[PDB]
Amino acid sequence: SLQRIVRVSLEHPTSAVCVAGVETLVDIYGSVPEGTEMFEVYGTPGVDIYISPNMERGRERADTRRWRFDATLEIIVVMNSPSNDLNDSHVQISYHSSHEPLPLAYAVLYLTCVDISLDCDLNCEGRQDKRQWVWGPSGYGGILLVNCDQDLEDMSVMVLRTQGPAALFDDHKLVLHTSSYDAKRAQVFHICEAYRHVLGQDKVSYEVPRLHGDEERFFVEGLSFPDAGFTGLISFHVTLLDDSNEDFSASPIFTDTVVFRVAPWIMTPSTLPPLEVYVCRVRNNTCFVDAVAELARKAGCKLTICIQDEMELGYVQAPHKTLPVVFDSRILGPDFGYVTREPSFGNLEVSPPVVANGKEYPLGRILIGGNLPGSSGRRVTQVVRDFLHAQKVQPPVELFVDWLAVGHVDEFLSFVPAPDGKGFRMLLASPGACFKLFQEKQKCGHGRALLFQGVVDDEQVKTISINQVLSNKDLINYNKFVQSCIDWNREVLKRELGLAECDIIDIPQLFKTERKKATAFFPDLVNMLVLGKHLGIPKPFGPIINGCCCLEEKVRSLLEPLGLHCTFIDDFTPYCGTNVCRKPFSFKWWNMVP
Amino acid sequence: SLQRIVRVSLEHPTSAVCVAGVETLVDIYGSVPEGTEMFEVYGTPGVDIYISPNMERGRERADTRRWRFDATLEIIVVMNSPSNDLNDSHVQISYHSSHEPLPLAYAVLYLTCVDISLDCDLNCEGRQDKRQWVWGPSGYGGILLVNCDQDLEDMSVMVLRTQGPAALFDDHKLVLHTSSYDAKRAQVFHICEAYRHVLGQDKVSYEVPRLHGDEERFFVEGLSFPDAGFTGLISFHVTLLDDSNEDFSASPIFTDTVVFRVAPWIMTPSTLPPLEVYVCRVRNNTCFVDAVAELARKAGCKLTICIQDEMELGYVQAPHKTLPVVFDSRILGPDFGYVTREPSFGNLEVSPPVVANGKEYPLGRILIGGNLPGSSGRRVTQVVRDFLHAQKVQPPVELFVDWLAVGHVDEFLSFVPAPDGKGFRMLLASPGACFKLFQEKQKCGHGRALLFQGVVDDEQVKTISINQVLSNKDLINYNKFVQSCIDWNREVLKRELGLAECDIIDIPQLFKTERKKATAFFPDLVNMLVLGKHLGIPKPFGPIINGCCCLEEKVRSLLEPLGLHCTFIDDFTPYCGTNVCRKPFSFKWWNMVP
């Protein structure tokens, strides 16, 4: 870089304000004396004086010798140290002729150095520039955590450094201002019950008292997540204004900016480590809550309370803290946030970190269960997907779920830790894996094995044999249909998540029809609970061969090789929902480069 | 890239639809015969059959020999040519054992190839990819021209290519769909009084009749420019849906997309060639309209009509046509468009093509006359700047105009053609250039020269001499103030427009005070009309030395060297506005890479 032109007169002295480190360039207002041929420049000790050709970029110290007068030359004055008193430094230019021993004329410029800096804390990824927000491993910006759609220890502090003569500000004003747009989505408090609401919704500008010496503290709070019309960027400026020309108008001296970005909302994948599990109270299903308790104690801690698929759990994060957030449509509350968008799929849908089509998704991708084109009803896209695309960090992919009676993505999809490959496996429900399994068992002579023999060990509940299933032509054809439905999604996922067949495990799962749409013929295996290396799998109640549920043995043969532990939980045995909280990524969202 | 999984059965044949060029991959539903060791694949002539390892990327033709059975292998079937009739082609897989001479079992898949393509016209900059919108010299997208905030020859045509058996579409449906968001800002007509409004504001989906044979034409019209909440992108999709499983649900086969971008609004710089000039009728100022007519005939054509600064003139452009557009707050109309944003500076403000801070601005930058921080009033930023930033193509810079009574950017700023350097010069009003000039004339003995001697040659209107001006201390100090005001803007422009001093010309201009704010002491020279190499300059009525307005002679000495022709027009002599239309850039906006 920033430069500034201050113009001096031969007739009388000039008075000016230097901002610490900014280059003031000094020109003359009007003409230079008669017969001028040379000039000298001189300054008090703290004033750095340079010359430069106005074409070339370099600078040279000027106070040491006498220069041939060239209009093309530039005088540049900088002051790095604030002034103690007004006009305690000065610059003198003298013009000279070879004939006349003495200066033709003097031009004197008294200066007052003030240091003004508006600042936050960004990051040291590529420390050192402009006031904008740089994504990436070599970028920088301020972060704002949004709490809601003491009061805030999760607040973002803003500091104004003002060093210089006190009296300077009898005459000069410090404005803190923002945009109307930026004001609607953020608010600032000045420290200065004690914290005073200076910049806010109607409030756009604010004269700074300078009630607290050298530095003036502020606390910023972001009120809105990035929406369809909001990029998540908030700028604040400070401006030094000159209001000494009582007859003239007020004029700007200097401006500084700080740019904040609102932290996006990030979904947690069922491959992240678990922290706490939300289970909704069941007077009826004691044993199931016991089993989930045992699982949690197998992995971590588990809280229970009087739905789960009604809301989603994610997090926001800044360098200082990460904050759990809940997306909805009343709360836990302590150490929690809330996001609500009002205009109902709501279910759990996010992938692990992946690489696809050259692009890289370090935080994974959000899987939105779509609604088939040309359909009267809308299922998930209730243009909150607005909000999810606006997050920018987990680009979503649409999936095909219209064929299910319920229509949840987790009904046929699961992501599980893997010790090799890409570190995870994708589990897909597969009627056809079950078909193959039943045929293999049939050819071994176990065609008479009875599904639902554990369920109907004591309460007769319509058992079926492998043979009866395999020869029910209608059931087989319907399951071929839903297998093809799942195939479509499989190929979509394989594309958008750059997955290979070797990364995918087909889980034997049958289906039947409720109102011409898919439901689970036997408990949906893939509707897992994934807590690190421990799995809460709906016990299938499949055919008992040699006193074992061959379905369970299959799932084990598939998953135990990967170090997983399969605990088959009795979800369907007795005639609310399930959800969990997870620790964030090791990866930091601001290091992504969309 | 796209792939698709079609599953076949040993029990009975399978029927499927191939989209032309898409890879169908063929697997078996359930298990493979007993003792299977080998397999062969075969197809009718138009069916290309390949094998691939599911790990590796290559493909190999498969119909020529007998393969060792490996579950890891992939069968891939493609059909590049549409089918004449249903199921007129097929694929047969046979499984084999070394012991048994004959195929253990067959799996047969009858196919119907249909070619479905949704298409527009993008560009041949880097022809050849994905359906998205690529900026740059090696990019592509569809363009939509917005006419308003026969019916349209400036319409964007959309084509659906459907080749294949007619009967196929008794059973299968073609949906044309868009987003609700995209629907609000665009509408489509199907040809198909004759053109039928199929996709529109409430309309999101549309079954395609196929009333017109192989290809179905559509005409798209963009209704909204890119705003704060609109990026200018509009996507349309076609989807082939299978609705033959009357008992099951409908399922997707294939989807295609075409992406349009709304063309931004581009301001025309006063260095572009002129086309037509808008002059508002003046019963009083005959001679001035005569003079502007003479200027236009010096350069081009000029129309006159019964303000100019009330609106702005720009253009939108697509590969087929460019359309003049007028931004407002009734019209010319034929070959014209209109943009209006409702919630008043309105004046003329745009720079020429420039390079700054590494970034490149091929179409120039928009100069927004800002309002000083913390001021009750808003002058230009009435959050239509929303709209101007949203255009994305001419990033705007804020300037300081609060010191003027009127406050127009053109009051002190002008861009003029230059034959060298950067091809243009920036002209700035400069009290100080005038100061220097008056001093030089004073030292030559012409201190008695009378300003306003032409104006007051016959009507005595308070003439001033050079000497009287120079010694009016108050006037000089005020003009030093406004010179510093202009200095600030000069440095801003020099930064944001990467300009050098050698690119700037200071034009001698004095000022006086109207209600503590700047107005022209003598007619504002820099408030030019720039028509190619011809200039309509307010005649200054400056001091007559040797029967010449020394101000005019100065302006000539500055501008004539650059090939310019200065015609001093009598704007202020007798006791509405001015505007012009310009030919677009040679540069094309879609070749910029913001």
PDB file of C-alpha atoms in Angstrom, chain A residues 60-160:
ATOM      1  CA  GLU A  60      17.304   4.008  -2.590  1.00  0.00           C
ATOM      2  CA  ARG A  61      18.007   6.008   0.546  1.00  0.00           C
ATOM      3  CA  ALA A  62      17.899   9.703  -0.320  1.00  0.00           C
ATOM      4  CA  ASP A  63      19.076  11.679   2.737  1.00  0.00           C
ATOM      5  CA  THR A  64      22.802  11.151   2.126  1.00  0.00           C
ATOM      6  CA  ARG A  65      23.522  13.200  -1.003  1.00  0.00           C
ATOM      7  CA  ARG A  66      22.230  15.811  -3.454  1.00  0.00           C
ATOM      8  CA  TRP A  67      20.215  14.615  -6.449  1.00  0.00           C
ATOM      9  CA  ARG A  68      19.831  16.091  -9.914  1.00  0.00           C
ATOM     10  CA  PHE A  69      16.230  17.254 -10.103  1.00  0.00           C
ATOM     11  CA  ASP A  70      14.123  14.831 -12.139  1.00  0.00           C
ATOM     12  CA  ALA A  71      10.337  15.132 -11.991  1.00  0.00           C
ATOM     13  CA  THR A  72      10.261  11.375 -12.711  1.00  0.00           C
ATOM     14  CA  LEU A  73      11.700  10.669  -9.252  1.00  0.00           C
ATOM     15  CA  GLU A  74       9.594   9.600  -6.273  1.00  0.00           C
ATOM     16  CA  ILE A  75      10.247  10.465  -2.640  1.00  0.00           C
ATOM     17  CA  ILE A  76       9.058   7.705  -0.292  1.00  0.00           C
ATOM     18  CA  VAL A  77       8.814   8.121   3.488  1.00  0.00           C
ATOM     19  CA  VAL A  78       8.103   5.306   5.925  1.00  0.00           C
ATOM     20  CA  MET A  79       7.840   5.250   9.718  1.00  0.00           C
ATOM     21  CA  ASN A  80       7.900   1.877  11.446  1.00  0.00           C
ATOM     22  CA  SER A  81       7.632   3.166  15.038  1.00  0.00           C
ATOM     23  CA  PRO A  82       4.601   5.042  16.414  1.00  0.00           C
ATOM     24  CA  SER A  83       4.964   8.645  17.511  1.00  0.00           C
ATOM     25  CA  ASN A  84       5.049   9.641  21.160  1.00  0.00           C
ATOM     26  CA  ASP A  85       3.580  13.114  20.558  1.00  0.00           C
ATOM     27  CA  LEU A  86       1.932  14.861  17.631  1.00  0.00           C
ATOM     28  CA  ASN A  87       4.281  16.008  14.864  1.00  0.00           C
ATOM     29  CA  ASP A  88       7.402  14.853  16.706  1.00  0.00           C
ATOM     30  CA  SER A  89       9.061  14.014  13.368  1.00  0.00           C
ATOM     31  CA  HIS A  90       9.402  15.800  10.064  1.00  0.00           C
ATOM     32  CA  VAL A  91      10.693  15.657   6.497  1.00  0.00           C
ATOM     33  CA  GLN A  92      12.369  18.602   4.774  1.00  0.00           C
ATOM     34  CA  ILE A  93      12.889  18.915   1.021  1.00  0.00           C
ATOM     35  CA  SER A  94      15.176  21.639  -0.280  1.00  0.00           C
ATOM     36  CA  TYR A  95      15.580  22.735  -3.884  1.00  0.00           C
ATOM     37  CA  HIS A  96      18.897  23.968  -5.209  1.00  0.00           C
ATOM     38  CA  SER A  97      20.598  25.772  -8.079  1.00  0.00           C
ATOM     39  CA  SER A  98      24.279  25.611  -8.963  1.00  0.00           C
ATOM     40  CA  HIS A  99      24.409  29.418  -9.120  1.00  0.00           C
ATOM     41  CA  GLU A 100      22.800  30.206  -5.757  1.00  0.00           C
ATOM     42  CA  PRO A 101      24.565  28.792  -2.659  1.00  0.00           C
ATOM     43  CA  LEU A 102      21.396  28.572  -0.600  1.00  0.00           C
ATOM     44  CA  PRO A 103      18.176  26.551  -0.965  1.00  0.00           C
ATOM     45  CA  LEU A 104      15.783  28.186  -3.399  1.00  0.00           C
ATOM     46  CA  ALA A 105      12.943  27.019  -1.146  1.00  0.00           C
ATOM     47  CA  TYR A 106      11.992  24.537   1.559  1.00  0.00           C
ATOM     48  CA  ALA A 107       9.035  22.183   1.805  1.00  0.00           C
ATOM     49  CA  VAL A 108       8.420  20.910   5.333  1.00  0.00           C
ATOM     50  CA  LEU A 109       6.126  18.024   6.295  1.00  0.00           C
ATOM     51  CA  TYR A 110       5.506  17.246   9.957  1.00  0.00           C
ATOM     52  CA  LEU A 111       4.374  13.687  10.555  1.00  0.00           C
ATOM     53  CA  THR A 112       2.570  11.676  13.196  1.00  0.00           C
ATOM     54  CA  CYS A 113       3.109   7.931  13.077  1.00  0.00           C
ATOM     55  CA  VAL A 114       0.240   5.778  14.318  1.00  0.00           C
ATOM     56  CA  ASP A 115       0.150   1.983  14.163  1.00  0.00           C
ATOM     57  CA  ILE A 116      -3.302   0.623  13.329  1.00  0.00           C
ATOM     58  CA  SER A 117      -3.832  -3.100  12.931  1.00  0.00           C
ATOM     59  CA  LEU A 118      -7.016  -5.169  12.872  1.00  0.00           C
ATOM     60  CA  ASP A 119      -6.256  -8.793  13.596  1.00  0.00           C
ATOM     61  CA  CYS A 120      -7.502 -12.280  14.433  1.00  0.00           C
ATOM     62  CA  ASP A 121      -5.698 -15.633  14.346  1.00  0.00           C
ATOM     63  CA  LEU A 122      -5.637 -17.666  11.150  1.00  0.00           C
ATOM     64  CA  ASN A 123      -3.107 -20.528  10.882  1.00  0.00           C
ATOM     65  CA  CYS A 124       0.569 -21.366  10.387  1.00  0.00           C
ATOM     66  CA  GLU A 125       0.138 -23.751   7.439  1.00  0.00           C
ATOM     67  CA  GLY A 126       1.849 -21.281   5.104  1.00  0.00           C
ATOM     68  CA  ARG A 127       2.350 -18.314   7.420  1.00  0.00           C
ATOM     69  CA  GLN A 128       3.935 -14.991   6.474  1.00  0.00           C
ATOM     70  CA  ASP A 129      -0.427 -12.185   3.212  1.00  0.00           C
ATOM     71  CA  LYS A 130      -3.383 -10.413   1.587  1.00  0.00           C
ATOM     72  CA  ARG A 131      -6.598 -10.077   3.590  1.00  0.00           C
ATOM     73  CA  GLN A 132      -8.681 -12.781   1.946  1.00  0.00           C
ATOM     74  CA  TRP A 133      -9.387 -16.424   2.811  1.00  0.00           C
ATOM     75  CA  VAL A 134      -7.046 -18.998   1.249  1.00  0.00           C
ATOM     76  CA  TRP A 135      -8.108 -22.632   1.212  1.00  0.00           C
ATOM     77  CA  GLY A 136      -5.471 -25.313   1.317  1.00  0.00           C
ATOM     78  CA  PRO A 137      -2.307 -26.655   2.957  1.00  0.00           C
ATOM     79  CA  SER A 138      -0.697 -23.262   2.179  1.00  0.00           C
ATOM     80  CA  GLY A 139      -3.544 -20.923   3.082  1.00  0.00           C
ATOM     81  CA  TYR A 140      -4.972 -18.789   5.877  1.00  0.00           C
ATOM     82  CA  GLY A 141      -8.151 -17.308   7.277  1.00  0.00           C
ATOM     83  CA  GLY A 142     -10.072 -16.639  10.446  1.00  0.00           C
ATOM     84  CA  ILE A 143     -12.631 -19.233  11.562  1.00  0.00           C
ATOM     85  CA  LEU A 144     -16.094 -18.576  13.019  1.00  0.00           C
ATOM     86  CA  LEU A 145     -17.922 -21.347  14.878  1.00  0.00           C
ATOM     87  CA  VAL A 146     -21.716 -21.187  14.645  1.00  0.00           C
ATOM     88  CA  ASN A 147     -23.537 -22.387  17.761  1.00  0.00           C
ATOM     89  CA  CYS A 148     -27.198 -22.080  16.761  1.00  0.00           C
ATOM     90  CA  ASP A 149     -28.863 -22.143  13.304  1.00  0.00           C
ATOM     91  CA  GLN A 150     -20.284 -18.084  29.476  1.00  0.00           C
ATOM     92  CA  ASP A 151     -22.443 -16.983  26.566  1.00  0.00           C
ATOM     93  CA  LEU A 152     -19.560 -18.170  24.364  1.00  0.00           C
ATOM     94  CA  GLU A 153     -16.186 -19.543  25.276  1.00  0.00           C
ATOM     95  CA  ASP A 154     -16.506 -20.881  21.711  1.00  0.00           C
ATOM     96  CA  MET A 155     -16.263 -17.302  20.483  1.00  0.00           C
ATOM     97  CA  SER A 156     -13.833 -15.762  18.005  1.00  0.00           C
ATOM     98  CA  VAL A 157     -11.770 -12.887  19.439  1.00  0.00           C
ATOM     99  CA  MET A 158     -10.855  -9.814  17.401  1.00  0.00           C
ATOM    100  CA  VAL A 159      -8.193  -7.271  18.329  1.00  0.00           C
ATOM    101  CA  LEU A 160      -7.563  -3.667  17.282  1.00  0.00           C
TER     102      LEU A 160
END
